[PDB]
């Protein structure tokens, strides 16, 4: 272990710091007419650590609770 | 760890400071006639930390509460 | 950390100071005839911190209250 | 922090001093005939700090009061 004057390193630390903080993007569009809706699209993309997905699933009920 | 005269660094800190404070943009348009509406569009885009999305979902009821 | 004679910095601080104070623009037009209206358009665009959107939603009733 | 002989600075302070004092422009036209009106247009544009919009909304009743 030798200290470095620069914070540059390999991609392993970049991947770790990307995964630990978690990434999720939600996109949805709703179209309605005269009060009623005729279509509704909704989706999301998730890339995060495995620990938070258990918590997501138990929030939505997949995990035992 | 060596102190630097300039605050410039890699993109990891930029990504972290972007994600922690949270980003959300809401766009919607409503058109009405003689009192009644014939169409209404509404949507939003969210890019933030995973911690605040649990709070959003429990505010809207997805998370267990 | 080295003091600078000029306040110029990167775009991160500009983005932070833009987002913290909040931005919202409201545009609406109403057309009426002989007392009654035949059309009414209203919309707004919001770009602000995530903290104030919970307060907006609870003011309009989306957040639990 | 170094004192300057001139008050010139970046655009951040200009934006802050523009937003804090608040901007609102109201435009409306009313046309009437033999006592009764046949049309009336009214609109306004607002660009100000988020704090005063809560006060506007509670004045018009949107905010809880």
Curated annotation (Swiss-Prot), chains A, B, C, D:
The gas vesicle shell is 2 nm thick and consists of a single layer of this protein. It forms helical ribs nearly perpendicular to the long axis of the vesicle. This is Gas vesicle protein A. Residues 32-35 are annotated as: Beta turn. It holds the Pfam family Gas_vesicle. Residues 11-21 are annotated as: Alpha helix 1. Residues 36-45 are annotated as: Beta-strand 2. One of its GO terms (molecular function) is structural molecule activity. It comes from the Bacteria. Keywords: Gas vesicle. Residues 46-65 are annotated as: Alpha helix 2. It comes from Dolichospermum flosaquae. Solid state NMR studies suggest the protein has an alpha-helix beta-strand beta-strand alpha-helix structure. The beta-strands are thought to make an extended cross-beta structure which forms the hydrophobic core of the GV. Gas vesicles (GV) are hollow, gas filled proteinaceous nanostructures found in some microorganisms. During planktonic growth they allow positioning of the organism at a favorable depth for light or nutrient acquisition. GVs are highly permeable to gas. GvpA forms the protein shell. The ratio of GvpA:GvpC is estimated to be 33:1 and more recently 25:1. Its main location: other. It is found in: Gas vesicle shell. Can be used as an oxygen carrier in mammalian cell culture; addition of 1.8% GVs in the medium enhanced the maximum glucose utilization rate by about 30%. The GVs have both GvpA and GvpC. Engineered gas vesicles (GV) can be used for noninvasive imaging in E.coli and mice. Heterologous GVs with 2 copies of gvpA plus gvpC from this bacteria and the gvpR-gvpU operon from P.megaterium make GVs suitable for imaging of bacteria deep in mouse tissues (e.g. the gastrointestinal tract), or when expressed in tumor-homing bacteria, can be detected in tumors. Belongs to the gas vesicle GvpA family. Residues 22-31 are annotated as: Beta-strand 1. HAMAP family: Gas_vesicle_A (MF_00576). One of its GO terms (cellular component) is gas vesicle shell. The keyword Iron-sulfur does not apply. Induction: Gas vesicles are abundant in low light, and collapse after exposure to high light.
């Amino acid at each position: 272990a030798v200290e470095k004057t620069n914070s540059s390193s390999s991609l392993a630390e970049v991947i770790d710091r990307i995964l630990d903080k978690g990434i999720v993007i939600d996109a949805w569009v709703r179209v309605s007419l005269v009060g009623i809706e005729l279509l509704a699209i909704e989706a999301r993309i998730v890339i995060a650590s495995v620990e938070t997905y258990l918590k997501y699933a138990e929030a939505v009920g997949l995990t035992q609770s």
